[PDB]
Ligand binder design. Structure first.
Ligand SMILES: NC(=O)c1ccc[n+]([C@@H]2O[C@H](COP(=O)([O-])OP(=O)(O)OC[C@H]3O[C@@H](n4cnc5c(N)ncnc54)[C@H](OP(=O)(O)O)[C@@H]3O)[C@@H](O)[C@H]2O)c1
Ligand SMILES: NC(=O)c1ccc[n+]([C@@H]2O[C@H](COP(=O)([O-])OP(=O)(O)OC[C@H]3O[C@@H](n4cnc5c(N)ncnc54)[C@H](OP(=O)(O)O)[C@@H]3O)[C@@H](O)[C@H]2O)c1
Ligand SMILES: O=C(O)c1ccc(-n2nc(-c3ccccc3O)nc2-c2ccccc2O)cc1
Lengths: 206, 206
């Protein structure tokens, strides 16, 4: 087990940007798929490789997944309020490209709403949650080594690295810093302990 | 009056109605956004301008924020404890409209539960608190001059002007009257001392 090359999908998002920065600082050779390159910061840590394209475009995903050791998925659809399939269709393209290229490890973020009663989901988040569920099923039925990361509210607190991780359930805390969440996405690259499990990271930021 | 034209969101609510009355008495030129089925009472004080629409429509929020000096946010769900995103989505529309119209000052009410240990928030209030948390992050990340008003129980005791304002922590009493809360929302328009802080107003009525 030695992951050196990773693809990150969703690297321009709030969690993606800090996951990308941390990965670069730790020494990973990171490839990102971005739809427009000007949103990547021009100062600080930069990825080794940039593919310009869409997770909905199978060829763009293929170019991104080729030659990787593992994939991190931090896709989201920003403000869709009504039925949407971007994340699950992108997950299908990711799965197909990982198969074609022999990449066997994927760490993907959905939501802790998948661990709660469906009546906890606010009405205007039901569509996105539904597609998270579709994307989770896609990844679980793929047969790939899949770590399901299902975070509660994503905050802006500083990196601590001291969060809780609860397997196949929700945990006591109900927030995770975007920085701590990115930290855990990368921690999942260094072990098979979470493979096949759903994970809930959460921490105290008093 | 350096701040003269204000938008109030939630003016028909418990705290809104007395905030509106006090603003009009103090000489503010008040614009309100009201939902079509829920106008202001016929006998009560009259705002200068009424927009009929929904905080969930960007166009209605834009009409309400255009030309203002400052915004007060007293949105809420009345007695309804169901999951919701009306406050966080409304705040996103308010931020965008403020940025487009050159309005910097936003005084917005969430709840003192944002200062609690999360494991201690009553489960019955967790869904509403989750949207207050989402709303607070939207406003904190906006870069606007944002006063985060985080009250404890809102009661029916009198207007006093004599309440305690505790910065960035819980205060010494567990109640604030709706009239004192509205008085404090208006006070925040006339100083910069609470910008970028959380504020907990509270009082002992005797
Ligand atoms: N906000 C929360 O508290 C919370 C809580 C639990 C779970 N989640 C979920 O966790 C995940 C990460 O969320 P986040 O807030 O960090 O994400 P985010 O800031 O909304 O960014 C989403 C990422 O996905 C990219 N993206 C969207 N559509 C794409 C497409 N067709 N092709 C390629 N890339 C695309 C976006 O690229 P662009 O920059 O090009 O748009 C961006 O990089 C999301 O699925 C979210 O729903 C969020
Ligand atoms: N002890 C407490 O009650 C307590 C304690 C701490 C914090 N809080 C929080 O304090 C805040 C203010 O509470 P409150 O009791 O004064 O408020 P409220 O009586 O619940 O009034 C809510 C206001 O928001 C309006 N509103 C709701 N949805 C809207 C929409 N889609 N578009 C436009 N306007 C909308 C309502 O309009 P309609 O007239 O059309 O309904 C009403 O004017 C709330 O966020 C509450 O959660 C309450
Ligand atoms: O920091 C403190 O002391 C403190 C913090 C929060 C409260 N809130 N806010 C609420 C509340 C009610 C309706 C909508 C949103 C809300 O947030 N309900 C309570 C409440 C909590 C415990 C017992 C009685 C209550 O009325 C009171 C005090």
């Amino acid at each position: 087990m030695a992951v050196k090359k990773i693809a990150i999908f969703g690297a321009t998002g709030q969690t993606g940007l800090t996951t990308l920065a941390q990965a670069v600082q730790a020494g990973y050779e990171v490839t990102v798929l971005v739809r427009d390159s000007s949103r990547l910061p021009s100062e600080g840590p930069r990825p080794a490789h940039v593919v310009v394209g869409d997770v909905l475009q199978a060829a763009d995903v293929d170019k991104t997944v080729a030659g990787q050791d593992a994939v991190i998925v931090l896709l989201g659809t920003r403000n869709d309020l009504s039925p949407t399939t971007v994340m699950s269709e992108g997950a299908r393209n990711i799965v197909a490209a990982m198969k074609a290229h022999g990449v066997d490890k994927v760490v993907a973020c959905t939501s802790a709403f998948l661990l709660w009663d469906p009546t906890k989901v606010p009405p205007r988040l039901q569509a996105v949650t539904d597609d998270h569920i579709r994307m989770h099923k896609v990844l679980r039925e793929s047969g790939l080594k899949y770590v399901a990361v299902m975070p509660p509210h994503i905050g802006d607190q500083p990196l601590t690295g001291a969060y809780t991780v609860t397997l196949d359930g929700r945990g006591p805390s109900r927030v995770i810093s975007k920085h701590d969440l990115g930290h855990f996405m990368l921690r999942c690259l260094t072990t098979d302990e979470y493979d096949g499990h759903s994970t809930y990271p959460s921490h105290q930021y008093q």
